[PDB]
Design a protein around this ligand. Structure first.
Ligand code: BR
Ligand code: BR
Ligand code: BR
Ligand code: BR
Ligand code: BR
Ligand code: BR
Ligand code: BR
Ligand code: BR
Ligand code: BR
Ligand code: BR
Length: 494
């Protein structure tokens, strides 16, 4: 019939000014007809008009819902259905308008600020939805809020991961270019030991990626959180690893003079030092930040495999470079020995007038060794420096060991050999590595063989420093004696 439902305008008047049960009476009448849905509707519009006048909209709607809750119980019979209508109106209108307002402007002017706003707006909305769930709305309310948040973020959170990666690729690219421009280095003799490894570029790349993970944690669907957080990681290993540090490792690998003369190749040891600190900053953000997001991954086993693979590819290159730098040093110590150690040193031309000291070949080497050891300590941190010295010291002991075996020794030449080793031992003591010192300790005892009289030869072999050594090793040194044939020293087949 002629619905004079425009007594709904009588309800509007009652709400305008004055607190009354007149709102209740008109509402109680209106539930008898279709139009009770419209009455509560205009009630929501009116109480919202004077509300939004604050800098913070999420506090404004929090105060709005509390004052409406105490009033709605006075006016309507089923406050729970009215209340759900309220917050739905707040979300579908006010919240969605405030989100579209913040994002449209910054979307085509500041992509990073867009991501930081989308993250902030989504966080405050969820925190707000947790405040609204405290009210006695119709249970299953949790699903109700979830649909409201989804209906105003579904398309923002859909194209999220693509904008996040497009941003990170571009921002990382700009950081790398800005660094290679400040060094006047176009991609693909340099006297400077330029490592091309910035501890600023890496820490700024990690700064950027860390923040991307945090946004990824809350803005990515939990079912796709692992695959999304790993997509971001692959961007890091493409710019930080492949493009920055792996590039500087190959560039630094070509500045090695290849075991020749005149080598100012302190360069690569500086590269090893920086790369190690970079690695410590790398896996630190990996364990603390990326791992909590990837822990629940279907194929986490393949995620850890690529992380390991990447960090081993460059681990090997560092091991190739430390090896090439070491035999460059061994190459020079060998050069000193061949050109400055003659036969007449251990096989003196005239037995009569010989002053026994360590050879000039010995001092030239020890002086060189010490000059390089110093450069190693000054170019590396305490942890990885002892592993390098150990290798150098082992190779150092190896060189002298085989060097001593290509000479014949007279009675007089014997002492000169010990004097050499004794000085070599002091040079090795400067390594501060027990292994190197102990290796020359056995070589020192070994030289004792080509000095003692033939009758006390098998006696000395029974000594504490020699007994626990292989008989073949004792034999190799006895053969170096000039009177190995002149005496019955062939009794070393036992
Ligand atoms: Br009115
Ligand atoms: Br209703
Ligand atoms: Br952020
Ligand atoms: Br959240
Ligand atoms: Br409930
Ligand atoms: Br930078
Ligand atoms: Br990439
Ligand atoms: Br280091
Ligand atoms: Br980090
Ligand atoms: Br001496």
């Amino acid at each position: 019939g002629p619905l004079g439902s425009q007594l709904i305008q009588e309800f509007t008047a009652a709400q305008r000014r004055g607190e009354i049960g007149r709102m209740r009476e008109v509402a109680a009448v209106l539930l008898h007809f279709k139009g009770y849905a419209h009455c509560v509707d205009v009630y929501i519009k009116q109480c919202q008009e004077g509300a939004y006048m604050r800098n913070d909209v999420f506090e404004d709607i929090a105060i709005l819902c509390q004052r409406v809750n105490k009033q709605v119980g006075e006016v309507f019979c089923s406050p729970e259905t009215v209340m759900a209508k309220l917050i739905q109106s707040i979300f579908e209108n006010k919240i969605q308008a405030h989100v579209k307002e913040r994002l449209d402007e910054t979307r085509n002017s500041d992509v990073e600020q867009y991501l930081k706003n989308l993250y902030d707006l989504y966080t405050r909305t969820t925190a707000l939805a947790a405040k609204l769930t405290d009210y006695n709305l119709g249970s299953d309310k949790h699903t109700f809020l979830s649909k409201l948040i989804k209906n105003i973020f579904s398309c923002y959170l859909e194209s999220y991961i693509d904008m996040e990666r497009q941003y990170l690729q571009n921002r990382s690219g700009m950081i790398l270019q800005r660094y290679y421009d400040s060094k006047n280095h176009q991609k693909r003799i340099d006297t400077h030991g330029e490592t091309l490894l910035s501890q600023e570029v890496v820490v700024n790349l990690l700064q950027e990626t860390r923040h991307a993970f945090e946004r990824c944690n809350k803005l990515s669907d939990p079912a796709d959180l692992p695959k999304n957080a790993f997509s971001i990681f692959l961007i890091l290993v493409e710019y930080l690893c492949v493009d920055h540090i792996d590039y500087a490792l190959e560039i630094g690998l070509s500045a090695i003079p290849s075991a020749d003369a005149k080598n100012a190749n302190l360069y690569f040891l500086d590269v090893v030092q920086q790369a190690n600190t970079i690695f410590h900053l790398f896996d630190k953000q990996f364990n603390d930040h990326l791992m909590p997001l990837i822990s629940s991954s279907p194929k986490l086993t393949e995620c850890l495999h690529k992380k390991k693979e990447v960090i081993e590819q460059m681990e090997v290159k560092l091991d190739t470079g430390i090896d090439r730098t070491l035999n460059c040093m061994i190459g020079q110590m060998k050069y000193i020995l061949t050109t400055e150690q003659k036969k007449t040193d251990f096989k003196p031309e005239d037995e009569n007038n010989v002053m026994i000291q360590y050879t000039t070949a010995c001092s030239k080497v020890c002086a060189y060794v010490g000059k390089q050891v110093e450069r190693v300590r000054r170019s590396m941190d305490g942890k990885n420096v002892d592993t390098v010295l150990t290798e150098l010291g082992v190779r150092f002991h190896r060189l002298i060991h085989e060097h001593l075996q290509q000479f014949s020794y007279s009675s007089m030449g014997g002492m000169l050999a010990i004097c050499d080793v004794a000085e070599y031992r002091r040079s090795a003591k400067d390594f501060r590595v027990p292994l190197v010192l102990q290796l020359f300790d056995t070589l020192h005892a070994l030289c004792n063989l080509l000095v003692v009289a033939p009758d006390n030869l098998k006696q000395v072999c029974s000594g504490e420093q020699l007994t626990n050594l292989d008989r073949n090793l004792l034999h190799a040194f006895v053969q170096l004696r000039v009177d190995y044939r002149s005496a019955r020293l062939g009794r070393h087949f036992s």
